[PDB]
Amino acid sequence: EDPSLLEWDADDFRIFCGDLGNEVNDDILARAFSRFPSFLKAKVIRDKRTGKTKGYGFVSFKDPSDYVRAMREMNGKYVGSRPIKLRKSMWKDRNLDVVRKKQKEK
Amino acid sequence: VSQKRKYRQYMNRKGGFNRPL
RNA sequence: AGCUUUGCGCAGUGGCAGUAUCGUAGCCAAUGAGGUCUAUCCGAGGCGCGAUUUUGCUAAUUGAAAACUUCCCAAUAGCCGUGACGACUAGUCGGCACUGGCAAUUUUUGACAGUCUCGAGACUG
Numbered sequence A: 001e002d003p004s005l006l007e008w009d010a011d012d013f014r015i016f017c018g019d020l021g022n023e024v025n026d027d028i029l030a031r032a033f034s035r036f037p038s039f040l041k042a043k044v045i046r047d048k049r050t051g052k053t054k055g056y057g058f059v060s061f062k063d064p065s066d067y068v069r070a071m072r073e074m075n076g077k078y079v080g081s082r083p084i085k086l087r088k089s090m091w092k093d094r095n096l097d098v099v100r101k102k103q104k105e106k
Numbered sequence B: 001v002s003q004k005r006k007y008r009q010y011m012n013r014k015g016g017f018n019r020p021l
Numbered sequence C: 001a002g003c004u005u006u007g008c009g010c011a012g013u014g015g016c017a018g019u020a021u022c023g024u025a026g027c028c029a030a031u032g033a034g035g036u037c038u039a040u041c042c043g044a045g046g047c048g049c050g051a052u053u054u055u056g057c058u059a060a061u062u063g064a065a066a067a068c069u070u071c072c073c074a075a076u077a078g079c080c081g082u083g084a085c086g087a088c089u090a091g092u093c094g095g096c097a098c099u100g101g102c103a104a105u106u107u108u109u110g111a112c113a114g115u116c117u118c119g120a121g122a123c124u125g
Helices: A028-033 A064-074 A094-105
Strands: A013-018 A044-046 A053-061 A085-088
Touching: A013 A064, A028 A053, A028 A064, A053 A064
Parallel strands: none
Antiparallel strands: A013 A053, A013 A085, A044 A053
8 A cells, every 4th residue: 555645535536647758747747737727736657766757647636527628628638748648547445446356246 | 396487687787787696 | 177189398118220320601492392103293301512430437359568656595483212411219200402213913094884773783895
């Protein structure tokens, strides 16, 4: 368990976006996505010990209604140096995989 | 019996050009 | 008072087919579109252009990798003999240790298994 997933969870929806340039996108994703709707949290997957951006990342959105438009408007849109591919987050943590296992046998 | 074939690393080693044991 | 007709809107439950669905600051059209059975009769859209296999989710496959803040080494975790240490009178006993052994009647490498009768016996191999 990584105590880093408890900063965006506010019943919000986490758009799950890949195809992000390694050399860029440290905060360009936040800059691009701040226009709609307002200030939020946008963080990029950057592994420690190497300073190498793993590319893909999250973005937290207040409302799924706003998320729908954001996805439909930024799906493949040119951000940084690569077009971004957007999908839905999973957050398959222990409290959910236990329920998944319980449902499997049922 | 059979043992996992102990392999080594080629790229991104941060070590000497020669081989470790 | 219930019953009932038509048009429209909203949902639920079913069936059918994907050579067809949709758009029309383009043109023409009940002051008539279109008429190859069918005409002193019939009566509604037609033509041109344009788009084309949505989305969420799930499953399978490819490969080294299909996209989201591990492997390996060393050591630790019963009895009979033997060696010391110790205790008690060459012998006996207790604990510890490890340099051989533990399927041939008294034990720990199996006289067991099947059958039948009303807790108890009989039959067979």
